[PDB]
Design a binder for this molecule. Structure first.
Ligand SMILES: [Mg+2]
Ligand SMILES: [Mg+2]
Ligand SMILES: [Mg+2]
Ligand SMILES: [Mg+2]
Ligand SMILES: [Mg+2]
Ligand SMILES: [Mg+2]
Ligand SMILES: [Mg+2]
Ligand SMILES: [Mg+2]
Ligand SMILES: [Mg+2]
Ligand SMILES: [Mg+2]
Ligand SMILES: [Mg+2]
Ligand SMILES: [Mg+2]
Lengths: 167, 164, 99, 138, 258
RNA sequence: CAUCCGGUCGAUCCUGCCGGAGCGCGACGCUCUCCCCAAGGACGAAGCCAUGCAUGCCCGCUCACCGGACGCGGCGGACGGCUCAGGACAACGGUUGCACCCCCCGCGGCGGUCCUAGCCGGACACCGCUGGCAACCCGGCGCCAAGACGUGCGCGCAAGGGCGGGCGCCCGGGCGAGCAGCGUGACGCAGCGACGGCCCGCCCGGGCUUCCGGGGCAUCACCCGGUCGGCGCGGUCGCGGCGCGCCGAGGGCCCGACGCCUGGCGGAGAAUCAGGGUUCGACUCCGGAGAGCGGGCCUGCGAGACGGCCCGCAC
RNA sequence: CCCACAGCCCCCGCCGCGGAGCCGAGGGCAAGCUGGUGCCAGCAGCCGCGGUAAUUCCAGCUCGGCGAGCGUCGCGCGGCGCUGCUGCAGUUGAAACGCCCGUAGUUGGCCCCCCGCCGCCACGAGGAAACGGGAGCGCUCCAGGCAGGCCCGUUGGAC
RNA sequence: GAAGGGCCGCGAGCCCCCGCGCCUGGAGGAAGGAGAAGUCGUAACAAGGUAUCCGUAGGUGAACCUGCGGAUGGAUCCCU
């Protein structure tokens, strides 16, 4: 069905190449998982039998993940609230779809439970006093079944803040 | 597939490019009469063998004397010729090979070697007795007229012990 | 980039002259070689085009000599990366330069 | 000279020979393809057809026949060699027809004849000429 | 493009040094996976049938192997297609015959009868040092044998002496200039010489130059250079000390034997 | 293993072609005493097929009949065999690489598993009773087995994720090459375990990949528009315009692009014979593709399988 | 004896079928006398024969070539230096653009003794056999195959 | 967790339009070749009875004729 074979493409000069064999199962593909934030309801993850008997799992729905604050070395499990920015398309943001690189809002309860007073990075403390903290996704849902990440800081935090402020 | 497909095979003679040539016909009939040749394929076979020997000798002679390959192949060829009796013992230089003639090949046939020993009246008589298995080489009897005897086996040729 | 990026050089190292530098971070390299024809006991001059990635650390114009190293497939036609540039004077004569 | 002779000139010589080898009539006939499509035998040694009409500086009337090839459906003319062999050929009869000595061109004083009859009704014509076989089945 | 692995082997496509006859049959034995690969091994049945002549057919060899009359490094093997390789031990207790598998000058496998003093061990060439699970260092050899916790002083391309009874190292020979070696592949298989130079080319093969005892010199790549002791061989070697004769000398030998 | 001969004229010398003379591959005709070897529906019908055969074996589980049936279970059936339709920067041949990869059997190691163990639980197959149907096929009730299925006793361990080297460059687990492994902070409890094997290495095999070679026509001279490159994500065993969104514009060509044609499978090789060459290469070994045409898929380490299943079309 | 069983080869005894065809005789091209027919019938790859002796048609005799094989048709190589790199021709036989400029392409005087790179020559490593060449061996010889005798290079299957 | 249903994905078959390649009928028109012992005249080969030929333009039953410029492959290697 779906394939990633190069035999259906044109050559570097723009010519059409002939089809000299039928489709092969080495070069198959599958439909995207399109993992959805939860926001008959619960976490759902599916397993896929891949080549060689290996097992691959794609998440279809999830709500929680582990997020780490590198500067202070504070890592907790937090609930994801909603997606606010994506560098590929606004449609993914409207639908609340989770992929690697998405910028999300997580609950501040686990991180304000402690070190809300300790003199750390000021730009993060103000977020802690509120209700949500800007974060990023580092894992690949649809391949491993998890949505983990880290808390933003440095120039990238300013970049995304300026990006999503005027809206 | 069948194992029989890997067996080799080849022809053993060459036909003249110009068929009708009076001197050639005369010479071929002459040779057939002296050596009692059944047909003209034997002459072609002899010519084939002579051509092979001549080509080997040429290729070897084109090289330098102190060439390892030249020494190896010349020694092998000379040893073969001496063993088969085509070339005389006293000749050991490669040059003498190129002057050889098919008569020398013919003279070592079984009919000839038994006729020169006086054991048969004529080549035709020799062929008739050979076909009737009345001759023996060493301890074995050979019924092929074209069988070629080796120099060490010339004195061991006799009449078949069981022959009547 | 082979220096600041996440690619590794491995395999064959080649040389050639620059043919075009119009893409964002890529160029086309010209290679020249000889082909022998046994029947006529003579040669033919032939050339091939090889596309490569050019990192911003290098500045290249047409005609310069570059050294390219092999890497994993970076695109549909690119499997090489520039590693060394030797400038050549502009206005110089185009010449058949096997390398 | 009048031919290119440089050490790096193999391509020019190749193309020159490629272009100029087409001027030979025999090579064109053999490797152009028009002859293959035009030849009624379609490259075969001989073909099989059906008789449909017996017809006729040397002044010697010759006996021939019109044939219609089965596999190709086209019409040709064939000539009956031996002496008195026309009687062995009857109208509406199956024959096997081969070529003459020359491949395509006419042979001898016969105008526009390039095919030969060799077998009739499954029996060799020459054999029937010598009485080796007989046509009592027909 | 075959859908799976291959299980047959045509006789004509078999390795040359096996010396199979062209008309023996359509097929040849296909060795199973084991210590040695297809191109550097030889099936057991060939030795048991076409060399020692103890069996005349496949069935006889199978019966003998089932009766467990052959030992390979002290472990009975019942597979007629078990691959045998270089520096193996081949002992048949029921006939008090013990051999070591080696290479002849012509580049073929040979059986060298040995003594009991040296038949309880084998020499192995180390090709790889890697970290396994939990960071524990390992090493691998040409016969597909892995050892844990080896001495740090052991490096790649060295030679290792392992006792067959237990499977433990006792001593090792470093790879250096002036150490007797034996060639295990290529045009120079079966020759014995001493290393004289080591030339390494960046990003490509490393070349080893050794001189024969008579004075001959030849070259080969490091991938098939096997140290068999220091100065003098640790194990027994065939009658000829790895000296390849020329064609003329070989022809003289043939004529003498005829 | 460097050869020529007859034909334009009233006669002569040339150019130039026609024909003859040799070998090999096939078909046709006549004929044929003995022995040995030996090809054999390939030749613009990859056209259509009655009839028989071409893939089984057995350690595990016996209250069957007198232990052998049958059945569940295990391995194999993806090798072998046939053919050359398709396909012309492709397949293929030699030469690289995966620091972008997967791998059954076999060989050698390894074996610490968080929160009734004198040994756990329920089923079906065969079989008995009872039945539908022209055939092919199956239905309902009923006691019983496991090296089958499910649960699971057990000294913290699968995948993935954050942090942990430099101050011009070079001078161990390992490399040509910052590659591996480990520590620590968070998540998650995957696999093995009712006669203990998850895991690692080698091996064969496969997937893609670098460089060179890879038919004819110029009464085909300009061609391409995911076409060229960049950024991000997804999918894949895995790299990659492989797919999607955005951005910029490019790429190829008389050293012949693009297009069209082929009675186009490729090579190792075969025919011929001074030397240089010309033609062929269905067929024995290797590689590729296919099983009426076109598609889709389950099982499984491994198939886009056809002596496996589903659909449309033609029979 | 061999063979899964049967043949076949080979060996031992008794009795005993010896059978040649296909093409041609003017030249190329080796091989000549009678009777018919009369530009008819027919032969003839090419030249040519046949209209009253036909050396060529149809028959008999004789003769020639190959031979358990010979002849006919088509294709490929050779012939062919008539595709020409080695190695054609271009005043009159077929064939130098009406002339000039000019890009791509092809070709480019002489000179530095020792350095670097490209081509080149030699050697080497690495990489399937089969086929081909080739060392040795008396399947009775041969086409073939990798064997055999004994006291065997560790018998050999080298390259 | 069955039947069934919705949207997307792979994608057959059919209908419609377009283009390419190969064969093929056709009143009439016109070219070439062969055959016969046809009719009309003589254009070229001799200075062929107007020397021949080249390019271009016009005309005529047919070969062909005429004008402009050119060549000798001409019927001239020869003249203050
Ligand atoms: Mg537990
Ligand atoms: Mg269980
Ligand atoms: Mg085809
Ligand atoms: Mg095959
Ligand atoms: Mg298939
Ligand atoms: Mg299928
Ligand atoms: Mg099948
Ligand atoms: Mg003229
Ligand atoms: Mg002329
Ligand atoms: Mg006139
Ligand atoms: Mg006139
Ligand atoms: Mg005139």
């Amino acid at each position: 069905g779906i394939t990633h074979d190069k035999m259906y493409k044109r050559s570097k000069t723009g010519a059409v190449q002939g089809k000299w064999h039928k489709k092969r199962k080495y070069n198959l593909g599958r439909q995207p998982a399109n993992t959805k934030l939860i926001v008959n309801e619960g976490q759902k993850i599916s397993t896929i039998r891949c080549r060689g008997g290996n097992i691959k799992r794609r998440a279809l729905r999830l709500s929680h993940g582990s997020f780490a604050w590198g500067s202070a070395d504070i890592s907790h499990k937090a609930r994801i609230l909603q997606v606010v920015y994506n560098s590929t398309s606004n449609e993914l943001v409207r639908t609340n779809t989770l992929v690697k690189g998405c910028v999300v809002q997580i609950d501040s309860a686990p991180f304000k439970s402690a070190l809300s007073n300790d003199t750390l990075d000021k730009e993060i403390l103000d977020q802690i006093r509120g209700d949500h903290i800007l974060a990023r996704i580092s894992s690949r849902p649809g391949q491993v079944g998890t949505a983990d990440g880290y808390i933003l800081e440095g120039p990238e935090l300013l970049f995304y803040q300026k990006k999503l402020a005027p809206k | 597939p069948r194992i029989s497909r890997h067996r080799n095979s080849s022809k053993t003679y060459s036909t003249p490019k110009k068929p009708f040539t009076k001197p050639r016909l005369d010479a071929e009939l002459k040779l057939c009469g002296e050596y009692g040749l059944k047909c003209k394929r034997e002459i072609y076979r002899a010519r084939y063998m002579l051509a092979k020997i001549r080509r080997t000798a040429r290729n070897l002679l084109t090289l330098d004397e102190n060439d390892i390959k030249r020494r190896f192949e010349g020694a092998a060829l000379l040893r073969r010729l001496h063993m088969l009796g085509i070339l005389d013992e006293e000749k050991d230089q490669l040059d003498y090979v190129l002057g050889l003639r098919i008569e020398d090949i013919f003279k070592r046939r079984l009919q000839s070697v038994i006729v020169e020993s006086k054991l048969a009246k004529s080549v035709h008589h020799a062929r008739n007795m050979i076909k009737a298995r009345h001759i023996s080489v060493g301890g074995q009897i050979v019924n092929i007229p074209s069988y070629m005897v080796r120099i060490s086996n010339t004195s061991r040729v006799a009449i078949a012990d069981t022959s009547s | 980039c082979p220096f600041t990026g996440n690619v590794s050089i491995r395999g064959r190292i080649l040389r050639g002259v620059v043919h075009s530098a119009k893409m964002q971070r890529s160029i086309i390299v010209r290679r020249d070689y000889l082909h022998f024809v046994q029947k006529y006991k003579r040669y033919e001059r032939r050339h091939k085009h090889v596309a490569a990635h050019l990192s911003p650390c290098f500045r290249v114009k047409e005609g310069d000599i570059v050294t390219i190293g092999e890497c994993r497939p970076l695109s549909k036609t690119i499997r090489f990366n520039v590693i060394k540039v030797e400038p050549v004077s502009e206005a110089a004569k185009k010449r058949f330069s096997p390398f | 000279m009048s031919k290119t002779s440089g050490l790096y000139t193999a391509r020019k010589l190749r193309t020159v020979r490629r272009v100029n080898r087409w001027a030979d009539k025999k090579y064109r006939k053999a490797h152009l393809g028009t002859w293959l499509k035009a030849n009624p035998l379609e490259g075969a040694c001989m073909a099989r057809g059906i008789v449909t009409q017996k017809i006729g500086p040397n002044s010697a009337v010759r006996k021939a026949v019109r044939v219609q090839l089965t596999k190709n459906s086209k019409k040709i003319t064939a000539f009956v060699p031996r002496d008195g062999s026309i009687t062995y050929i009857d109208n509406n009869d199956e024959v096997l027809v081969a070529g003459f000595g020359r491949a395509g061109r006419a042979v001898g004083d016969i105008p526009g004849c390039r095919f030969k009859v060799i077998k009739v009704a499954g029996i060799g014509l020459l054999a029937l000429f010598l009485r080796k076989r007989e046509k009592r089945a027909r | 493009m075959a859908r799976g692995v291959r299980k047959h082997l045509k006789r004509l496509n078999a390795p040359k040094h096996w010396l199979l006859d062209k008309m023996g049959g359509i097929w040849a034995p296909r060795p199973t996976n084991g210590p040695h690969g297809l191109r550097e091994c030889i099936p057991l049945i060939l030795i048991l049938r076409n060399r020692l002549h103890y069996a005349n057919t496949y069935a006889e060899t199978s019966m003998i192997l089932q009766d467990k009359n052959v030992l390979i490094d002290g472990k009975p093997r019942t597979d007629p297609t078990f691959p045998v390789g270089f520096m193996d031990v081949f002992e048949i207790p029921k006939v008090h015959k013990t051999f070591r598998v080696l290479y002849d000058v012509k580049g073929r496998f040979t059986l060298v009868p040995i003594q009991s003093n040296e038949a309880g061990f084998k020499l192995c060439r180390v090709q790889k040092i890697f970290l396994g699970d939990k960071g524990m260092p390992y090493l691998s050899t040409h016969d597909a044998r892995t050892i844990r916790f080896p001495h740090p002083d052991i490096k790649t391309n060295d030679t290792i002496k392992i006792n067959l009874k237990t499977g433990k190292i006792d001593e090792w020979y470093k790879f250096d200039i002036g150490k007797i070696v034996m060639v295990t592949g290529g045009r120079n298989c079966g020759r014995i010489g001493t290393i004289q130079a080591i030339d390494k080319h960046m990003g490509s093969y490393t070349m080893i130059r050794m001189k024969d005892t008579e004075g001959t010199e030849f070259l080969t790549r490091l991938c098939n250079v096997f140290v068999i002791g220091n100065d003098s061989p640790a194990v027994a070697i065939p009658t000829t000390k790895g000296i390849r004769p020329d064609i003329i000398k070989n022809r003289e030998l043939r004529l003498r034997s005829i």
